[PDB]
Amino acid sequence: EETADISLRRQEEYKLQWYYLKDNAWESLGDRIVNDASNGLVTSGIINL
Amino acid sequence: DFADIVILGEEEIGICADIQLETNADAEDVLVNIYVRIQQFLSPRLKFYT
Amino acid sequence: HTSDLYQEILQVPGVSAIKKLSIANYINGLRQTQGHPWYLQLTDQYRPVL
Amino acid sequence: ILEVLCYAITDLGYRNNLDIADLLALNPQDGNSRENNFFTPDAVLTCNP
Amino acid sequence: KVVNPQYERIQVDFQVKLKAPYSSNFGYYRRELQQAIVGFLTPWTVDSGADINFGGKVYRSSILKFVEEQYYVDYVVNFKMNLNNQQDIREAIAITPRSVITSVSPKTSNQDHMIEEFIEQAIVFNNQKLESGVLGYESLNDLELG
Amino acid sequence: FDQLLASYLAQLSHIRDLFSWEVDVTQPQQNDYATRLQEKQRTYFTQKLDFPEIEKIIPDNYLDVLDEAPETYRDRRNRFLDHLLARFSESFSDYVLLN
Amino acid sequence: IRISERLRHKGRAVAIFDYERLVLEKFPQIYKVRCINHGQFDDAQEQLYE
Amino acid sequence: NRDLPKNPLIRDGVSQRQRQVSALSPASIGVDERDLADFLVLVYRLS
């Protein structure tokens, strides 16, 4: 948790994005995440896909 | 410091509606209850405690 | 927002269904606008009442 | 006073366990007694062809 | 003669505002609400399902009441209802005496319920002033003394 | 205490008058319906006490203070008539022009 | 429920109320039913005559 | 295609849960429905 950049807070246009693979084509997972306790990989936690 | 003191006014909210009633109903009391509940919704007051 | 009134009018015993609902703004006894089915904007200096 | 009252209440509860056919009986000596509660099968279960 | 019914399908379309902290996961809660409306319009599939007809009609306000009761919803705007190519209806009536009302599904038809997010800063009002520039209708700062 | 015990038993003697279908009439008349007079238009019934030296303690007539208010009579009579109608699968609440 | 309904339709089907209640009692696997008066159904066309 | 007449009676059917009635259950009307306050009022008026 101590290794990140503290210059400015991550803006909203730069969220993380999740995909899954389907025979060389990538598809979005954005609407199938129930809970992300890591808050976008800033603290340790469980993401539920 | 304090620049000024301003007294607020008030607006009236007029409501137009078409309501379907149940068979065992009286429109008069129902409308009284509607007015009471809406007025309580819009302008709550605070309680003082011991 | 009209839904805040829709959900409370639906709580009175004897009310079956709401076929029509809209609201309008009055100041000094005169209608200020035409009204709107889903939301209404208030004036800066005034408190809403029924 | 308490004991006398409990004895009277026992009498009251005693009189509620008489058969329902006896609680609803009509007075044979009152000429003004009429049937005013029930209908008989001939008057309820029947219907014209 | 004893026969089987004829089914009609309903579609809805509205914009919604969620409560915090649910508002940060909108795409997940749009799916939870779509499946909830389908269960509402098919009371034979669920035990103790309640009825929606009042007389021979279904009203738009009874679906709006069910949406407003979900624990993650703040308010709804621009609610619309569709019945078999009829585009904006206040009350749905049976077409034939055999008609029975059900929901729209992407695997029995190719239509679903359309739900999008309401955004405050992008709002446009549709409400024209009855008068302008005269006494009784303007702030003191805007009286030009013509 | 005697008044409460006597009232309890008066409620047992008069069961058939809670479920009767009779029509309340104030002026005796022949209308081909079964009719009921003022002494039986009650949903609570009472008795007069009897003990030694009653005439010095409870004078001429005291039961008038025990009568139920007309609003209670109307409400309970209406509910009993509703219950008796319901046994034939019918109620007045389904007919708009009737109310 | 059963006996109060029978005391009204007498076990015979002459009206909308009678057709509906005689079915719901005998066949528990039905959820809802509707009786259509003076209407006929044509099997070959799948058309209902009103 | 032929413009046939319509049925002028508009209604819905009956479900299995709409066969319940509230007035039919014997719990709707009791023989003695009085509580403590009524007995206190009674003793006060009899005194």
Specify which residues E12 forms β-bridges with.
E81
CA distance H11 to G48: 17
For residue D46, how many other CB atoms are within 10 A of its CB?
8
**Contact G/E (≥3 CB pairs under 8 Å):** yes
Contact yes or no for H12/E53 (Cβ under 8 A): yes
CB-based burial, D1-36: b 16+ in 10 Å, e otherwise:
eeeeeeeeeeeeeeeeeeeeeeeeeeeeeeeeeeee
Cβ(A41)–Cβ(A16) below 8 Å: yes
Cβ-Cβ contacts under 8 Å, F93 against chain B: 23-24
Beta strands in E1-146 (DSSP E): 6-18, 57-59, 73-83, 91-93, 99-103, 114-117
Q: Where are the alpha helices (DSSP H) in chain G?
A: 2-9, 16-26
With vertex at residue G14, the alpha carbon angle to CA E99 and CA H15, rounded to the nearest 5 degrees, is: 40
Q: Collect all residues of chain E within an 8 Å Cβ-Cβ radius of residue H17.
A: 48, 51
Beta pairing class for B9-21 and C46-49: parallel
CB contact under 8 A, F83 and H45: no
Instruction: Establish whether chain G is in contact with chain C, requiring a minimum of 3 CB pairs below 8 angstroms.
Output: no
What is the bridge-based pairing of β-strands B9-21 and C15-27?
antiparallel
Angle between helices F2-13 and D2-14 (to 10 degrees): 0
Which amino acid, C20?
Answer: K
Of residues F34, F18, F35, the one with CA closest to residue F26: F35
Q: Is E25 on the interface with A (CB under 8 A)?
A: yes
Q: Sign of dihedral through CA atoms G27, G28, G30, G32?
A: positive
To test the contact with chain B by mutation, choose from C12, C32, C40 the residue with the greatest count of B C-beta atoms within 10 A, namely: C12
Taking contacts as CB-CB distances below 8 angstroms, the residues of chain E near H7 are: 97
Q: Does E114 touch chain C (CB under 8 A)?
A: no
- Whether residue H15 and residue G36 make contact (CB cut-off 8 A), yes or no, is no
Q: Is the previous residue joined to E21 through a cis bond, with omega within 30 degrees of 0?
A: yes
The interaxial angle of helices E26-40 and E60-67, nearest 10 deg, is 140
Q: Does E44 sit within 8 Å of G31, measured CB to CB? A: yes
Backbone angles phi, psi at E36, to 5 degrees: -75, -35
CA distance E95 to chain H (A): 10
Residues of B numbered 28-47 whose beta carbons fall under 8 angstroms of chain C's beta carbons: which are they? 29-30, 33-35, 37-39, 41-43
Q: Do E44 and G48 touch (CB under 8 A)?
A: no
The β-bridge relationship of strands A35-36 and A47-48 is antiparallel
Q: What are the tokens at E48?
A: 């103790």
Largest Cα separation within chain G, whole Å, is 41
Three-class HEC string of chain C: CCHHHHHHHCCCCCEEEEEEEEEEEEECCEECCCCECCCCCCCCCEEEEC
Q: With beta carbons less than 8 A apart as the criterion, state whether D23 and F15 touch.
A: yes
Is F3–H32 a contact, with Cβ atoms under 8 angstroms apart? no
**Contact across the interface for D47 and G10, Cβ inside 8 Å:** yes
Considering only CB atoms, H7 lies closest to which of G31, G33, G50, namely G50
How many beta-carbon pairs below 8 A join chains D and F?
22
What is the Cα–Cα distance from H39 to H32, expressed in whole angstroms?
Answer: 12
Q: Which chains touch B (3 or more CB pairs under 8 A)?
A: C, F
Among candidates B11, B21, B25 on the partner chain, residue whose Cβ is nearest the Cβ of C49:
B11
Q: Are β-strands F35-36 and F23-24 bridged in parallel, bridged antiparallel, or unpaired?
A: parallel
Distance from the Cα of F90 to chain H's closest Cα (Å) equals 10
CA dihedral for E100, E106, E108, E111, sign (positive or negative): positive
3-state secondary structure chain F: CHHHHHHHHHHHHCHHHCCCCCEECCCCCCCCCCEECHHHCCCCCCCCCCCCCHHHCCCCCCHHHHCCCHHHHHHHHHHHHHHHHHCCCCCHHHCHHHC
DSSP H or E segment with residue B9: strand B9-21
The distance of G37 to chain H (nearest Cα, Å) reads 9
Q: H4 vs G49: CB contact, 8 Å cut-off?
A: yes
- Residues E55, H15: C-beta atoms closer than 8 Å: no
Stated as kind and residue range, the H or E segment containing B17 is strand B9-21
Q: What is the resolution of this structure in A?
A: 3.2
The residue of chain A nearest to residue E30, with distances taken between CA atoms, is A31
Cα separation, B37 vs F84, whole angstroms: 37
B18 touches C: beta carbon within 8 Å: yes
Method of determination? Answer: cryo-EM
